[PDB]
Write a protein that binds this ligand. Structure first.
Ligand SMILES: NCCCC[C@@](N)(CC[C@](N)(CCCCN)C(=O)O)C(=O)O
Ligand SMILES: [Mg+2]
Ligand SMILES: [Mg+2]
Ligand SMILES: [Mg+2]
Lengths: 293, 296
């Protein structure tokens, strides 16, 4: 799975997942050229969803994408490998087109550990598995050597979502293993990653501006770097402001400000932004045309 | 404030055939008690909290509580979570099953803001009536409890009595105790146990004490009595083992050392954790030779 993809926010209403809004947000993604959706990633507050909720989000999404050509890359990562295998199987059993699997967080496995963790996951299913490196959140980094070995050693492993701010590593990955699918995990540098041969994005910004992110990715895949860079440059201010506080606090605030969700609700320890950052997000949004439903 | 201080151990969790070796767990805790340790921390990072089931997590806390009854040794139960609802539940559990207090690591992976951290710990503290020790380890969580947030929580919440600091930032340790000297600063970094204690820290939550509880015990008690020459001498002696126990991610080296010492049956982890490199295995074995390891 490649192309423009959205790390879906998870809207809450009165402390529960707003399931109708969840399906409605995914339809809006489909209407605006998105190629795949990622239920229950970091942006979807996977850490604070119950097992049941995690499972249901994937189900809505698979169901809502059914019939369209939009794929579901299910959030299935865990820092407990038994758990990650579990999630992988669930996704497969419930029709996900594939899986996203974040590098274990908090426990800091070694490179050998990561290899084992992912081999376990990959062998438990037969759908594509997309590796996810975000060391600022996990405390560990999947080495370039480890990524490559996994790609070559495990049939299902087809690439990595990179959120490390390290374009050198992106060169390193595609120079030594050009067959893998490098996916941008940091919206601000979507174009530089695509222009080095990246084949997709898993975007926070596309929650609010899916048409802009989808166009950017498709310009780039069609080798119109001029127009892809144009959108990337235009999106920089919003791409930065969406991380003025830890994601998904700004994007949910933006979605609520645009009237796209009913309630600016998080699950603790996530919370509302500062009032000043709230106003900063509101101000930056005003320079972009935000698609409705 | 009610407090839990002194020399404390972040207990490893031994596995046998993919199950918690509950008999070895109790035996290991008794070894800590008999070597001068003041409190034990079941199921922290060193106890592989991430890969235990909820039931196993509960079981290890209960085993700790039961093993320390009839002694002066306290149980500071590992109760952290990156989901506030789960952390409150763990705090409640620890309270209801006889723990003396809880340790609660800063939420990992989802990187809450300072406002969110405040709210997170306030909900935990307001849910029980036993001491709560914050735990700051930004290298593992991806976030930091700022000094201001720590102090605000200490002053605003009755049961929050201090912080376990594992951030290699002695400046912050000065900052903390210079602006709020009533709090209990606990070293979460073995190599710098003495510097933290010598600045007014009141205890350690140690990985090395799994292997050398008597030495960590003496270091802390020497330091608490302001016998800084003797405390520093032990800290200096311990530096080599303190560092080698993090050649690979904790608790991979300490469990390796415990296995080499014959203190656990199997060198078993739960994935994504795994045995160390063959090279680091030998390095740990070599460093160990320079220390006298207490038996059972
Ligand atoms: N997607 C919904 C599940 C969320 C579970 C958890 N909050 C905690 C994961 C866990 N491995 C649970 C350990 C439970 C026993 N201590 C962790 O806290 O590390 C996470 O993965 O962030
Ligand atoms: Mg398409
Ligand atoms: Mg994931
Ligand atoms: Mg004395």
């Amino acid at each position: 799975i490649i192309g423009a993809m959205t790390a879906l926010i998870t809207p809450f209403k009165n402390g529960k997942v707003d399931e109708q809004s969840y399906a409605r947000l995914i339809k809006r993604q489909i209407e605006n050229g998105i190629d795949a959706v990622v239920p229950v990633g970091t942006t979807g507050e996977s850490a604070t969803l119950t097992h049941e909720e995690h499972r249901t989000c994937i189900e809505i999404a698979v169901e809502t994408c059914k019939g369209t050509k939009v794929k579901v890359l299910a959030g299935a990562g865990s820092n407990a490998t038994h758990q990650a295998v579990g999630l992988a199987k669930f996704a497969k059993e419930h029709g996900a087109d594939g899986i996203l699997s974040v590098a274990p967080y908090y426990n800091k496995p070694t490179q050998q550990g990561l290899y084992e963790h992912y081999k376990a996951i990959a062998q438990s299913v037969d759908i594509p598995v997309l590796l996810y490196n975000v060391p600022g959140r996990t405390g560990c980094e999947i080495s370039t050597d480890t990524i490559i070995k996994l790609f070559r050693d495990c049939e299902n492993i087809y690439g990595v979502k990179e959120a490390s701010g390290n374009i050198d590593k992106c060169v390193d990955l595609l120079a030594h293993e050009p067959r893998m699918m490098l996916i941008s995990g940091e919206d601000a540098i979507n174009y530089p990653i695509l222009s080095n041969g990246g084949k997709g994005v898993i975007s926070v910004t596309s929650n609010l501006l899916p048409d802009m992110i989808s166009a950017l990715t498709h310009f780039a895949l069609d080798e119109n770097y001029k127009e892809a860079k144009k959108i990337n440059d235009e999106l920089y201010n919003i791409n930065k402001i969406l991380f003025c506080e830890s994601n998904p606090i700004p994007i949910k605030t933006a979605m609520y400000l645009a009237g796209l969700i009913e309630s600016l609700e998080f699950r603790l320890p996530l919370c509302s932004p500062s009032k000043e950052n709230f106003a900063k997000i509101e101000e930056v949004m005003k320079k972009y045309k935000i698609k409705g439903f």
